Amino acid sequence: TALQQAFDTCQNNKAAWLQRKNELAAAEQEYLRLLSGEGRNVSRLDELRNIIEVRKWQVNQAAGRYIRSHEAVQHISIRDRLNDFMQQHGTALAAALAPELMGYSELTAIARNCAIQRATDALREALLSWLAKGEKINYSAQDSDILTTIGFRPDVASVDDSREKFTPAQNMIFSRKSAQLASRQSV
Amino acid sequence: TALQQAFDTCQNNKAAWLQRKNELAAAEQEYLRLLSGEGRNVSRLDELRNIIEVRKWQVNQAAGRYIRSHEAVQHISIRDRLNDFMQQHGTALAAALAPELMGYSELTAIARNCAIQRATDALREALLSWLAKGEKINYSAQDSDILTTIGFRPDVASVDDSREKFTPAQNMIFSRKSAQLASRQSV
């Protein structure tokens, strides 16, 4: 039943990412409003710059978390859907692959790897031709609702906001700065 | 009828390789019979050694051709069986794998490559799990007799006699010698 946990984790990550996004947006609109004012407020200006940077880093982290959770839930859906499909048609699929993987357990590790490699690239051209027919298909009936709610692909905002990457030293220093800012805003 | 052509071509190659080994074996039998004799026959000994080596090369070539035909017939049988089976079950197969194959043609080349790679390792894990369950695999009912005639693996003779490889220079040298020997023997 881990699919439900993955789905709710993905939903929570998406909600947190959206909260980071709109909080950051409010932050930069307030920063623009303050800089447009006559008052110099240099301390206010550079503390708002620091806030902008740290909130943008938090948005990047939340987007990365959401992408990873979406990939994890998609992987869980793929694995259990393939599990039930394999339970349903394993004997027939093996009979299709009988010239290749017959006596699989009675073989060494490297021979097993080579045999399954032949099986799977044969499956490669099989699926290539099947899709090259040109038909259109929908989601699996059992878990259609979850996969439709999470979507085929994540949001473009989640991918273009997370395209930038930080070195581990930057990650550590921004984590420290975010903790300091959280402590400051808590009090 | 392509499978029938592969089958009888493999049978012809197997018969030719059997004839090659029979001729070679008679060759060293006669060579050792002459060597055991007290007659000098030095030129006869040298030409019989040439006979032995050219027959060994011919046996190697015949075994290699037979192995190649075996691989070809196994590959075509796998292709046909896979085509039939997953043509039958492709609706559920692609429903299980939908979250990554939506809009495959509309997607770009790198997206296509990523999607097919994800499909591949999903099938990897599914088939290795099924094989880890350990139930026996049987040949397809439609082509059981043919696959039993060819068999899962060629004879051990074909694989140990062809272990050694020949450089191209030796290849056409031996081909020329074999042609000359066939020409003289036909007379």
Author numbering:
A (entry chain f), B (entry chain e): 4 to 190
What did the paper state?
Phage satellite P4 polarity suppression protein, Psu, a building block of the viral capsid, inhibits hexameric transcription termination factor, ρ, by presently unknown mechanisms. The ρ hexamer adopts an NTPase-inactive, washer-like, open-ring conformation until NTPs (preferentially ATP) are engaged and RNA is bound at the SBS, leading to ring closure and RNA entrapment inside the ring. Our cryogenic electron microscopy structures of ρ-Psu complexes show that Psu dimers clamp two inactive, open ρ rings and promote their expansion to higher-oligomeric states. ATPase, nucleotide binding and nucleic acid binding studies revealed that Psu hinders ρ ring closure and traps nucleotides in their binding pockets on ρ.
In complex III, two hexameric ρ rings are bridged by six Psu dimers, that connect ρ(A) subunit 6 with ρ(B) subunit 1, ρ(A) subunit 5 with ρ(B) subunit 2, etc. Six Psu dimers bridge two open ρ hexamers, ρ(A) and ρ(B). ρ subunits are designated by increasing Arabic numerals from the centers to the peripheries of the complex. The different rotational orientations of the Psu-bridged ρ rings in complexes I, II, and III lead to different spacings between the innermost ρ subunits, which directly interact in complex I but are separated by a gap of ~ 30 Å and ~50 Å in complexes II and III, respectively. We further refined complex II (ATP; global resolution 3.8 Å), complex IIexpanded (ATP; global resolution 3.6 Å), complex III (ATPγS; global resolution 3.65 Å), and complex IIIexpanded (ATPγS; global resolution 4.25 Å). The ρ hexamers in complexes I, II and III exhibit slightly increased inter-subunit and ρ1-ρ6 rise values (8.4–8.8 Å and 42.2–43.9 Å, respectively). Psu interacts predominantly with one ρ CTD via the tip of its long coiled-coil (helices α1 and α2), the N-terminal part of helix α2 and the C-terminal helix α7. Psu helix α7 (residues 170–186) is placed in a cleft between the two neighboring ρ CTDs, covering the corresponding nucleotide-binding pocket. Psu R43 at the tip of the coiled-coil engages in cation-π interactions with Y197 of the main interacting ρ subunit. Finally, Psu P171, A172 and M175 (helix α7) engage in contacts with the T154-loop of the neighboring ρ subunit and cover the Watson-Crick side of the ATPγS base bound at that subunit, stabilizing it between ρ M186 and F355.
